[PDB]
Amino acid sequence: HWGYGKHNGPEHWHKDFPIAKGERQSPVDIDTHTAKYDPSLKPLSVSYDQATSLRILNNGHAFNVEFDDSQDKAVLKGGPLDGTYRLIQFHFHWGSLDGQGSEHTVDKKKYAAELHLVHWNTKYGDFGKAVQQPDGLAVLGIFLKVGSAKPGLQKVVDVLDSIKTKGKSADFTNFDPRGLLPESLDYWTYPGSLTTPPLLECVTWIVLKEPISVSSEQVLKFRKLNFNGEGEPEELMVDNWRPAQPLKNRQIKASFK
Numbered sequence: 001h002w003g004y005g006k007h008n009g010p011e012h013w014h015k016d017f018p019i020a021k022g023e024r025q026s027p028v029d030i031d032t033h034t035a036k037y038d039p040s041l042k043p044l045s046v047s048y049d050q051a052t053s054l055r056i057l058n059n060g061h062a063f064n065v066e067f068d069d070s071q072d073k074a075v076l077k078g079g080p081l082d083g084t085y086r087l088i089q090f091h092f093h094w095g096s097l098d099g100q101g102s103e104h105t106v107d108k109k110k111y112a113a114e115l116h117l118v119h120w121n122t123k124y125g126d127f128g129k130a131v132q133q134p135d136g137l138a139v140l141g142i143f144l145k146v147g148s149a150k151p152g153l154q155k156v157v158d159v160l161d162s163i164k165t166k167g168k169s170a171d172f173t174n175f176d177p178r179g180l181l182p183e184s185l186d187y188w189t190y191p192g193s194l195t196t197p198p199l200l201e202c203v204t205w206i207v208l209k210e211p212i213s214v215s216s217e218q219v220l221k222f223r224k225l226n227f228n229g230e231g232e233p234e235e236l237m238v239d240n241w242r243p244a245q246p247l248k249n250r251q252i253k254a255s256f257k
């Protein structure tokens with residue numbers, strides 16, 4: 001099965017998922033000097049005050065913080081987006097070392113990790129339908145750098161011991177994802193894909209320019225998770241990122257000058 005090892009990693013994925021070599025794959029390098037300011041882009045609207053988190057799951061490739069998406073409770077709109085996109089979950093991609101871990105890069109710079117807040121277009125009724133559409137998802141990508149602690153991340157860090165291995169989940173109610181956002185909502189946007197199999201080309205990417213800072217202790221706790229199941233040889237959950245893919249026939253737009 002696919003993963004991030006030498007024998008089943010990103011360079012292998014195309015064999016089971018031929019779309020891996022498609023025309024709008026993610027992540028990509030964001031060349032800041034080539035991205036064009038688009039004055040017609042609207043400001044983002046991130047409405048998370050009514051978010052209802054439910055559970056945290058180690059799915060064997062990352063951990064997902066899941067939300068109740070059966071009503072418009074936490075939504076993303078505006079920016080490049082037409083309509084309303086509901087928050088379903090967030091997860092991260094991170095490295096074994098502070099110098100790698102992000103999927104998107106900025107002028108080839110890699111960050112220590114990258115947060116993906118995943119939202120689906122409500123005009124498609126459910127997430128499974130939405131991923132089959134070119135405008136089905138909007139993913140808000142936020143870079144993490146190591147420095148000062150992010151206080152709003154700590155509740156996530158502290159539950160990881162309870163979901164160390166693949167398939168473990170834990171109750172995770174009343175978590176406020178507003179505590180994971182940087183001050184500025186300036187962003188780059190482009191059409192792309194999921195960055196894990198099934199690699200579906202259904203994502204409007206919205207990548208924030210301003211990283212959040214997390215502490216070395218916080219990211220060290222991510223790196224204590226396991227890709228393996230309980231009672232299996234330990235394989236640390238690290239370097240669960242896909243490298244940058246060809247930009248092909250796409251332009252990255254900036255919301256800012």
Ligand SMILES: N#CC1(c2ccccc2)CCN(C(=S)S)CC1
Pocket residue numbers: 064116118131139194195196197198
């Ligand atoms: N979990 C999960 C994802 C998934 C998994 C199976 C089918 C469709 C989507 C959605 C969010 N993902 C990205 S934003 S990288 C990871 C893959």
Ligand SMILES: [Zn+2]
Pocket residue numbers: 091092093116195
């Ligand atoms: Zn992701």
